[PDB]
Amino acid sequence: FVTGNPFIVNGKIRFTNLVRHVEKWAKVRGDKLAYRFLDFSTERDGVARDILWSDFSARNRAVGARLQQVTQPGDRVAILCPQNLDYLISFFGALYSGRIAVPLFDPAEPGHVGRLHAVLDDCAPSTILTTTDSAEGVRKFIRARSAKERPRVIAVDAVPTEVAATWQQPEANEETVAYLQYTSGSTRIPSGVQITHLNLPTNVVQVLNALEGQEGDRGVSWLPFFHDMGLITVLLASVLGHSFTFMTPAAFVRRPGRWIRELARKPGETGGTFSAAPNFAFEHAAVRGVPRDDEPPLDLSNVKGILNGSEPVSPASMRKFFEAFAPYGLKQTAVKPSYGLAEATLFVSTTPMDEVPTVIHVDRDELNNQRFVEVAADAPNAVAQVSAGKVGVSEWAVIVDADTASELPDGQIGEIWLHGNNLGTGYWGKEEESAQTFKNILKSRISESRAEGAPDDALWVRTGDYGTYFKDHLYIAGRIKDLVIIDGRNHYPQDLECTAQESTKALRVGYAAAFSVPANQLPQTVFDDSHAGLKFDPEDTSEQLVIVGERAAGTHKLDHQPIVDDIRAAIAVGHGVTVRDVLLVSAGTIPRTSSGKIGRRACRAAYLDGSLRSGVGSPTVFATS
Ligand SMILES: Nc1ncnc2c1ncn2[C@@H]1O[C@H](COS(=O)(=O)NC(=O)CCCCCCCCCCOc2ccccc2)[C@@H](O)[C@H]1O
Numbered sequence: 249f250v251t252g253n254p255f256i257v258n259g260k261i262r263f264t265n266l267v268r269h270v271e272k273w274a275k276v277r278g279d280k281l282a283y284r285f286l287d288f289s290t291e292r293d294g295v296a297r298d299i300l301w302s303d304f305s306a307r308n309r310a311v312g313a314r315l316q317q318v319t320q321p322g323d324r325v326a327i328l329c330p331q332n333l334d335y336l337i338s339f340f341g342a343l344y345s346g347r348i349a350v351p352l353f354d355p356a357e358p359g360h361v362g363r364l365h366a367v368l369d370d371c372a373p374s375t376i377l378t379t380t381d382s383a384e385g386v387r388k389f390i391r392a393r394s395a396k397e398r399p400r401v402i403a404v405d406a407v408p409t410e411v412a413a414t415w416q417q418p419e420a421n422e423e424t425v426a427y428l429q430y431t432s433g434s435t436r437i438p439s440g441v442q443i444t445h446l447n448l449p450t451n452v453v454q455v456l457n458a459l460e461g462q463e464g465d466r467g468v469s470w471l472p473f474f475h476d477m478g479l480i481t482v483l484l485a486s487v488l489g490h491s492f493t494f495m496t497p498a499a500f501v502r503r504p505g506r507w508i509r510e511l512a513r514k515p516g517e518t519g520g521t522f523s524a525a526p527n528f529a530f531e532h533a534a535v536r537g538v539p540r541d542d543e544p545p546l547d548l549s550n551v552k553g554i555l556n557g558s559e560p561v562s563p564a565s566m567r568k569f570f571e572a573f574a575p576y577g578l579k580q581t582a583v584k585p586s587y588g589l590a591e592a593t594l595f596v597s598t599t600p601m602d603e604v605p606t607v608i609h610v611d612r613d614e615l616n617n618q619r620f621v622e623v624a625a626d627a628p629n630a631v632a633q634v635s636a637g638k639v640g641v642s643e644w645a646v647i648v649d650a651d652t653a654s655e656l657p658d659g660q661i662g663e664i665w666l667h668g669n670n671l672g673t674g675y676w677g678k679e680e681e682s683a684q685t686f687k688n689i690l691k692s693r694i695s696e697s698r699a700e701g702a703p704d705d706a707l708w709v710r711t712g713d714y715g716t717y718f719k720d721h722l723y724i725a726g727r728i729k730d731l732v733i734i735d736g737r738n739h740y741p742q743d744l745e746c747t748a749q750e751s752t753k754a755l756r757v758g759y760a761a762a763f764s765v766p767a768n769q770l771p772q773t774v775f776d777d778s779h780a781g782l783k784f785d786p787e788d789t790s791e792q793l794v795i796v797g798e799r800a801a802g803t804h805k806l807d808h809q810p811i812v813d814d815i816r817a818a819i820a821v822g823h824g825v826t827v828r829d830v831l832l833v834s835a836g837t838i839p840r841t842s843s844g845k846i847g848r849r850a851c852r853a854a855y856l857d858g859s860l861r862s863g864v865g866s867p868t869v870f871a872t873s
Pocket residue numbers: 431455459461466467468476477481484485488522523524555556557558559560561585586587588589590591594595596636711712713724726727
């Protein structure tokens with residue numbers, strides 16, 4: 249699978265069904281450690297829970313068989329389990345049964361129980377997989393829903409291993425849906441991306457090829473298995489030939505040094521380590537994860553690549569991360585900005601293995617007008633842009649003017665459209681939205697197209713992201729739906745947030761949200777302020793800028809103006825827009841998505857409801873102070 253590659257013939261992927269492969273892999277390395285769960289739920293210093301490939305293989309076959317009895321073909325099997333070893337057994341066990349898996353989370357964890365109801369409504373699974381300790385909690389949750397199709401709850405650790413003897417190899421085609429990856433799609437109703445048996449292995453090869461993963465290397469992770477980056481990482485790490493070590497996201501947030509520690513060289517280890525994380529985590533680890541004087545020596549010279557993706561990369565957070573860990577051997581080539589999305593299984597691009605991150609600066613006015621014009625770092629009105637690198641093999645990413653379905657030249661910002669075998673096939677039960685998102689014809693190409701190699705009649709998937717190529721690197725400008733359009737002009741919310749943050753110490757880094765709202769709904773307090781601009785008018789529906797930013801840690805007083813004036817002035821000058829309401833709230837209050845990204849839509853929804861000014865929560869595993 250990996251050197252130390254027969255699936256890449258003449259620069260193209262070739263090599264299906266994972267169950268088949270997982271089983272061979274399991275028997276060959278039986279009695280070797282497959283997974284190690286570092287459990288920090290009871291002991292702060294942690295407890296190691298291990299499972300060998302043979303045991304893992306056996307458990308998957310037991311669960312698969314139990315499912316093959318209590319479910320019908322076509323049924324969905326949802327996993328409502330905390331992050332631990334039974335989660336993997338539940339997920340793999342579901343794949344082993346041949347039914348469509350739906351990896352989710354334990355209703356007993358905080359943050360998004362509301363999403364869980366929506367997903368269950370959408371895919372109506374006949375069976376829920378969980379652990380014995382979470383079972384009562386899961387049954388309570390399920391009982392509270394409609395009696396009609398009330399699904400069976402199965403505790404996987406209670407299923408005897410010998411049941412595996414009645415397991416029958418499921419038969420699967422390459423186009424068969426293996427599982428559903430739920431994402432908060434175009435509407436309130438979540439979308440379940442159909443990931444097939446061909447999508448998985450293709451994207452694994454795409455990733456391992458880009459990282460030059462070799463036998464002897466190993467993966468480490470704290471990412472949630474209910475998110476694409478966390479789940480796919482399990483599979484990537486599993487094929488490196490060394491055990492995969494993981495922890496829960498909450499354990500990372502509480503003490504990020506636990507992750508840093510697992511990334512370190514083990515005694516006598518010659519291979520390298522890989523991991524992945526969202527931007528905010530580099531900031532957190534840089535500040536909270538440096539080892540004290542007491543701790544045993546820490547060596548990070550073995551770290552090959554920590555992929556940084558899922559949200560815009562802050563050059564300052566990366567800088568602070570490199571600087572905090574450089575003394576321990578962390579190479580400048582070890583942090584790798586990358587791009588991906590659920591619809592592509594996971595991975596689309598990453599920085600080439602041998603190079604450091606590419607960070608450039610572009611003129612703001614040109615950027616907002618959909619063009620990359622490079623400018624010096626200290627140039628006024630400059631916007632930092634971090635490259636997402638080069639597109640994976642046997643995969644294409646083109647920049648398109650959606651209106652006419654035409655490719656755009658380099659430097660021009662358009663929507664990013666993708667084509668490749670790693671691209672999902674649709675959204676569960678959504679025929680029309682699936683057609684609109686996944687079955688698009690690229691009508692016009694520029695000569696020397698980025699579609700070179702794709703068939704003329706190749707189908708393209710619309711990502712919903714704006715982006716461009718610049719000096720052969722793919723840049724992710726931002727998410728189309730998150731744009732702040734005011735007075736007929738676009739603004740990237742992360743750009744406005746950066747400016748707000750940079751103007752005043754009263755805001756904590758990475759916790760700001762910029763969104764537009766019709767002048768109708770903004771509070772009365774805004775009109776009673778000389779620093780406002782507009783005045784009372786119930787007819788006016790024009791979009792107006794609002795900025796919400798968590799108060800820097802240790803904030804106990806309210807001295808709004810001096811901070812707000814700096815923010816409004818900083819944004820007026822550099823963006824040509826007047827911030828109307830600057831709302832600063834309790835540390836750890838701004839809404840976070842389930843993977844820990846800032847929830848802008850949710851911050852806008854709660855701003856209007858008055859649900860945000862007030863709030864001693866809402867608990868999330870990502871909360872800190
Ligand atoms: N670099 C970026 N900059 C700005 N925005 C980015 C972004 N990446 C994603 N996004 C934004 O997030 C959206 C997608 O969101 S999502 O559906 O929730 N999915 C996501 O966010 C998924 C992002 C995935 C990024 C690539 C990560 C590859 C990690 C491989 C590890 O390798 C290993 C590890 C261990 C052992 C061996 C190998 C995208 O549509 C875009 O708007």
